[PDB]
């Protein structure tokens, strides 16, 4: 199988590249960074969401593995010390796979993103004023610092900031938290909503058209948007595992102890 | 098919009841409070509550309608001028139906209970203290208030009210919301919870082993217990549908405007 | 000078009592726990508390002192290592004081009781509705779980998990946060409030007339209440202080890191 | 005494305007936007924060009065009818007056900035990361989009919508909230902070040292910033009152129900 090796560019992430790529060459396991059909990251979460990002059209055909050279990540999950065992266990292509879903945005004026997180939206400078749309139904008039519509396992990441809850990522879904909205004129739910595989909710420009769109950490002001529609993605990312390490159990060292 | 009707028991839900029962005698429809086939309440939120638990052991048997003589309900969604129509239609048996997911509880001492929004533990006065343990692992040593664990529909309840997200019934899960947790030697993850199907969440007793346990609207003292174990029924409730009112329709209508 | 002193009823703190008193029989010094100059604590806040209102009809002619056996309190911040040196220091009567302010609740059916911490009202079972009436004018109608009116040193406690500020203790002033309020019918602020002096808050019942009414740790279930009043006491609590152990630096050894 | 007005811009607020003016010509009342001692706004809120920014050297030679053309306002809380009756009391010069406080902001790399309402930091792009340091203290190090510091009556704007607290004007104080923390590395304190006059709050960068900074309305990218300061002010605002519209009455008609 065809593989490739990112690192956060730190000494410490390039040695443990370094090494298994060498124990790869101990295995039929040839080096691909442009039609690979494993993806390690060596570094943190975010060093992952670049892999991600980097590849992101292949994501049919790869699975993605991540190494924490600090602390505990929600998708870099494996300790440096059980890299060679890594090496070792994707040499013979017996694992199993598991996905979590994805969100679909799309911007018209069309351009579609991907995001493993979530998809924020804010104002170009001024006031952020949007009219919430649900399946074609006008839900609300949100004013504020601007939304958030998360993935499962980006629930906690920013999501997590903003009140939202912590969703299991086998549920296929996808959450939005409100930032900052006024309440008194305008009138939002306050509350995050979760929404299922199909429904379609739409933001609309009351006045200003232009936004600070994000997906993940890359972030562009767009001008001149007409609507932004988000909706669970029907692609989904495939992980590697080798072994048990429940989501539950990566939320509780990460935010209660380890 | 056999039917029966619950009311609030004021003036207008009285008539209307005789009413429905009048025109539902113009058909081939006996009147069976023991086991019918239709359950129709008229009243609010509460008197549909009470009709599920009056059933509760016969759900898969039964297709509840609920009518609101007052403000619009989540359950109670039908309005009294639509009574004559749903009379007619229900004669038909060519409805179709809508299953929403429920809560089962279980008490150790063993009792088993069934929400139809949600069930919550509290202290019996004095501190409540509980250890939280997540599919055998312990998560978390809650100190507060208490908890609560909701489904779906009944995230628009109590659930709403402790910061927990909106959830579409569509998806099967249960939802777990903090009361004023102390957060300081202890350490609770602040953020709600969804689980999918099959997880199972239990609250252990680390000093006081009496609780005050609710499931929806019924709520007892319960004493010396060992064990509470939240988990996504089997069971579902099953609606009779005859036109199309979205949940998140049902949403606005209750919290932005109608 | 008169002096007393309290214990947590544990071997560490009765021991260190026992010593502090033997100390003191070094110096000029009557033991009395009647009519003490002086009321040493010793154990935790909690110590504190019930040390407080045993002497809460004297307030003006003691100066209180806590000692921690465990971890820093915000009421017991000195350290048991610090002891022999509070004996000494007290003896001279040089020392400065510092004064907290109260919370006077009134209830009427008269009763007055003091508040170190914060006044709660919850109901007696059953749904929880009163009107909130501040300085004669009508405000809202609250409908949930309870309320909670805290002081300024209270606001660490009760008031922080109700998602209330932190106040600092030389601002005159007390502040009212909700208990899971419902908002769709009803309609409350949601904000916490801070009242200045002379601002009088009251409840009063709409349906039920009986709530269940805590100040600081002890809580009665008060029947046929016709009107709860806080306002801003004239009487504060006096503290003696030989060095300075700022507020702030309280709250963050407490809450980030000692 | 000299006098001058400002209009939101459209019909209304300009003709209510060319009103009062000729009103004004029938008393002895010159003129004068240089000098005046009375200023009037005539809009919203806005409309009363320019007016307050285009003289805030002067403010304790002013008394200002808002009038709102709209909704009401927190600082335009006079209806267009009651516009004759200003007009008249404000001749006799005979009117009480009422001060509210004001935060002081520091900028060093030095900039000195007043604020009715509030001010906020946010970073220029990138990861916001700042040293919160409370009377020379370090207090925590914030990660997230920016805090905010408010004056009491800026505490129902951008305050409220970020968990605040309402706080009584009569209150000297400022208080602290926080835009999305991350809580995990980092740890802050959660809860909002009210500080007392002569507390003062800095913040410091960490890495970064360019922060979008706002003083109310106006917003401002500073570059090279080292320290960023809040104090309260010890300069107030000057509010002339021709009648009792308590604060709270002004946040229920708001708020609650007008
Ligand atoms: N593991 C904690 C660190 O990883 C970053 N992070 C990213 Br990128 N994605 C997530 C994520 N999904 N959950 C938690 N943290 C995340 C998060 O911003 C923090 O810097
Ligand atoms: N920049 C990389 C990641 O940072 C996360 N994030 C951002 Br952007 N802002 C916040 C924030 N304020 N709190 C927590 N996480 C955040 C967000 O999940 C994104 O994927
Ligand atoms: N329709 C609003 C009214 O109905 C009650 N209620 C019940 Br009972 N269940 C729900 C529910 N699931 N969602 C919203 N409100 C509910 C809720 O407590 C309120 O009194
Ligand atoms: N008593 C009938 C219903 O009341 C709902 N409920 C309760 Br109990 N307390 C609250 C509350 N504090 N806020 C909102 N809903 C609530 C809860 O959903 C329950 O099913
Ligand atoms: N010092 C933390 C411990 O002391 C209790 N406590 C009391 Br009693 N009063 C306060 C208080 N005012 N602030 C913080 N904690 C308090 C608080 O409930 C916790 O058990
Ligand atoms: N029982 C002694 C003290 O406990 C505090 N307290 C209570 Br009661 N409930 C909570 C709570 N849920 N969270 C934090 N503090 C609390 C409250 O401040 C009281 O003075
Ligand atoms: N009266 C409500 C309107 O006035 C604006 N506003 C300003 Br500007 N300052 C305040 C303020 N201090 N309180 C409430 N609203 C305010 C607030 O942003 C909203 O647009
Ligand atoms: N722009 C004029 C006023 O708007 C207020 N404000 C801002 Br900026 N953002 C928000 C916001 N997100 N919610 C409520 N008020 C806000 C803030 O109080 C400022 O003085």
Redesign the pocket.
């Given at each position: 199988m065809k593989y490739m090796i990112t690192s956060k560019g730190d000494e410490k992430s390039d040695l443990l590249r370094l090494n298994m790529i060498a124990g790869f060459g101990e295995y039929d396991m040839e080096y691909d960074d442009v039609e690979p059909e494993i993806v390690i990251s060596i570094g943190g979460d975010g060093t992952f969401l670049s892999a991600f990002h980097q590849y992101e059209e292949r994501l049919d055909e790869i699975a993605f593995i991540g190494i924490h050279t600090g602390h505990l990540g929600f998708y870099a999950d494996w300790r440096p010390a059980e890299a060679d065992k890594l090496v070792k266990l994707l040499a013979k292509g017996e694992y199993q796979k598991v996905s979590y879903p994805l969100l679909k945005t799309t911007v018209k004026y069309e351009a579609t993103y991907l995001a493993l997180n979530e998809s924020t939206v804010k104002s170009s400078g001024g006031?952020?004023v949007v009219d919430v749309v649900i399946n074609d139904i006008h839900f609300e008039r949100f004013?504020?610092?601007g939304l958030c519509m998360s993935t499962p396992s980006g629930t906690t990441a920013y999501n997590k900031s903003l009140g939202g809850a912590l969703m299991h990522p086998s549920i296929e879904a996808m959450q939005l938290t409100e930032?900052?909205?006024?309440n008194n004129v305008y009138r939002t739910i306050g509350s995050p909503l979760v929404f299922p595989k199909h429904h379609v909710v739409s933001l609309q420009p009351v006045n200003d058209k232009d936004f600070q769109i994000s997906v993940d950490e890359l972030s562009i002001l767009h001008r001149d948007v007409q609507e932004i529609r988000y909706e669970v993605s029907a692609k989904k990312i495939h992980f590697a595992r080798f072994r048990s390490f429940p989501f539950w159990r990566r939320v509780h060292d990460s935010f209660i102890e380890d």
């Open positions: 006031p952020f004013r504020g610092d930032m900052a909205s006024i």
